[PDB]
Design a protein around this nucleic acid. Structure first.
Length: 72
DNA sequence: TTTTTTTTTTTTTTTTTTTTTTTTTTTTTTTTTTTT
């Protein structure tokens, strides 16, 4: 299976109406220096719509999440 | 024959019903082969 396991007991995954799984895949670079990181959010549970609808996006330091980058 | 008159005091306990929680990695090992 998957060795990784969250902390804080397992009384929270029953009540949690929706659980995300955020991971950092790559880093965005302006030539040589890094400005942001490539995040990959995966919905591992959901009580309001089908689960496992993993969605990827890029977040820039200071400027926040890159809404425009993913809209295009 | 007539002719009623006045209450007094507490004694005793009886029985338990129910579980609720995980949490943490740890470690490298060993070369092979001259070619003209």
């Amino acid at each position: 299976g998957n060795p990784e396991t969250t902390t804080g007991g397992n009384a929270l995954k029953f009540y949690a109406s929706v659980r995300l799984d955020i991971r950092r895949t790559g880093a965005v670079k302006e030539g040589d220096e890094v400005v942001g990181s490539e995040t990959r959010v995966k919905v591992v549970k959901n009580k309001v719509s089908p689960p496992f609808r993993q969605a990827e996006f890029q977040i820039l330091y200071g400027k926040g999440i890159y809404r425009t980058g993913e809209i295009i």
